[PDB]
Design a protein around this nucleic acid. Structure first.
Ligand SMILES: [Mn+2]
Ligand SMILES: [Mn+2]
Lengths: 372, 372
RNA sequence: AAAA
């Protein structure tokens, strides 16, 4: 353990996780990691998130998290001298991006003009630069996987990338099946949310719509949700009426748009790696679960969350869109750090001032039907 | 001007606005304020927001905003030296709280151990400490008004703390009129959202409920909303049925709870000054306006936003509570700064696990019916 | 407390 990595622990874990893995990628030496943290951050389990994201091996690296006062500059510098008494280390690498300005400046005054030390700073959205001894800039490109990102936030997640239909079908599914049958799709939405149908698919995996009683379809109490209309729209999308699973119904009522968005990202977006894209994702931190439609990590390590609303047209759509904007911004601002971009994708045309102004102030990128 | 105040401009304007007004309050000298900013912040109008909150006499203080690279440490140092060559200033005061770490440590190294300079740092939520020349701590208590807080964020707002009823009435309004008439209030809620009733109040200020025909009351299509039931509940609250205003209906359908929360804060809360309490305020930044029920600034200068939901009972209530939590978190995390506490007040008893877990993860303090 |  002849190389030590000194990092300051604060709310944003990415600057530390990104930096540490990068040094691991360039210099594959075994190291000891010194995380300078505080009582406040250790209560939020921040240094632990740093460990689990990189999930090194006990042999390869040693982690030590030491405590200091985040606001006493002289205490942070004094704790550093006591630790580096008659130092045996051959390479001292210091990343002053984390912590408070007090914590960073305190560590900086101790390590500046030190004989065996490299000092780095990571400006957000820019390439990592070292400040001492030589002023240099390094590219932080493709350094992090998606799993490493969410692990740094203490997030557990599951996803299902299985699509009911393939990319070639999803490129034309709107023009061929959706546009001319939106009233029939509204009937299936009523079917999907009907008390009986939602509970029977808890009991059976497939369902034969031909052998379903007719009374069950009228109990839905929606004009479009007739037995003939529902069987017809199932056939329009190319499903086997004898073997209908809940996944197929979810596809018709808008699940197609999520798969269209998901596959478009995997196949057309070149600044994102296909392996870092997830569909129908569910996150959990502190036993709080949220479902995000499509999330991905681009080559620049910025996280992108997309809320997919197939159609939000009509005035009852503006009520749905405003809730989607609030829901999206609430989730992303609380669960994720500062390096995220919010998106709302829709096939309907958003031409009303209030959602557009709300989105611009929230920072939510909208990709309208005009841009799809 | 013989005193200069150097501040770094960044996302958070409160630490600069707080500090500058404090030094003005302590020394009362005419001074020049040098705002060290960047291209990125001047696009967000940050230095403009800072000046505006203070609004000092043009004669008594002069502002100069100079630009730098937030990530170039040597460039920020050079702009400082060129500016202070043969400086005429007797007192140079430096507040390194703003800006990036690069900007902060650069400003620190330029002024550290230089004569006629005081260096300050403002840790969030603690007393302001100066680091040079003498280590000292100062109290930032009752330093900021509510108006100064919202002005520092570029927010336009209007409010009238006018209540339909007074504190003496709003204490006990629940026990005397609301608790035993919850079904009658639901009819009035249905009445408030009826197309006819909401539109006539667009044209007329008073309404005579005695000459409204019953056919208008059954068009509401709510079991409780009979003409006698609505006349009954209006008189229970003490309103004149011959001339009922929109304020009176809005009061019954939960507006009473906003006034109760507002007045309780003004009369019972020990850490907040009544002049820093606002009711039914509507904010606007960019071109997006939202309405907040009760917001106030406590004597510690932390802003408190309250979402008042009178009742969230039943399955139809959880959807309102779930939406209120997203909406609250979305606004305060996007429109306000780092030093805010979010609250949701309700008369109902919240025991459901998921909303409590959501609120705790969002950081939303909930005060249910247990704590009136 | 990657621009309290
Ligand atoms: Mn969806
Ligand atoms: Mn409300």
């Amino acid at each position: 353990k002849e190389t030590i990595l000194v990092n300051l622990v604060s709310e944003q874990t990415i600057p530390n996780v990104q930096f540490i893995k990068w040094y691991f990628n360039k210099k594959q030496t075994p190291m000891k990691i010194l995380l300078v943290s505080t009582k406040e951050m250790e209560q939020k389990e921040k240094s632990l998130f740093i460990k689990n994201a990189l999930h090194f091996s006990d042999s390869f690296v040693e982690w030590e998290t030491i405590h200091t006062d985040g606001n006493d500059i002289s205490k942070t510098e004094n704790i550093l001298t006591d630790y580096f008494r008659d130092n045996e280390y051959k390479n001292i690498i210091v990343n002053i991006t984390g912590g408070t300005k007090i914590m960073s400046l305190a560590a900086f005054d101790f390590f500046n003009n030190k004989p065996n030390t490299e000092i780095f700073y990571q400006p957000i959205g820019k390439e990592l630069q070292e400040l001492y001894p030589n002023k240099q800039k390094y590219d932080m490109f493709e350094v992090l996987s998606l799993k490493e990102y969410l692990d740094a936030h203490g997030i557990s997640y599951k996803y299902d990338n299985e699509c009911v239909k393939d990319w070639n079908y999803n490129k034309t599914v709107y023009d061929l099946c959706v546009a001319d049958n939106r009233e029939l799709i509204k009937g299936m939405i009523a079917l999907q949310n009907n008390s009986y149908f939602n509970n029977v698919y808890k009991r059976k995996d497939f369902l034969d719509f031909t052998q379903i009683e007719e009374e069950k379809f009228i109990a839905i109490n929606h004009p479009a949700a007739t037995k003939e209309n529902m069987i017809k729209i199932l056939q329009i999308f190319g499903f086997d009426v004898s073997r209908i699973e809940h996944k197929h119904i979810r596809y018709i009522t808008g699940g197609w748009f999520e798969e269209y968005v998901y596959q478009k990202i995997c196949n057309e977006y070149h600044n994102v790696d296909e392996k870092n894209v997830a569909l129908n994702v569910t996150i959990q931190k502190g036993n709080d679960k949220n479902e995000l439609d499509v999330i991905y990590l681009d080559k620049d390590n910025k996280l992108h969350v997309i809320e997919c609303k197939s159609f939000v047209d009509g005035n009852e759509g503006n009520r749905v869109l405003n809730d989607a904007l609030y829901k999206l911004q609430a989730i992303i601002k609380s669960k994720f750090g500062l390096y995220v971009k919010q998106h709302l994708y829709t096939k309907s045309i958003i031409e009303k001032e209030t959602p557009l102004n709300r989105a611009k102030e929230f920072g939510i990128d909208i990709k309208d039907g005009t841009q799809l």
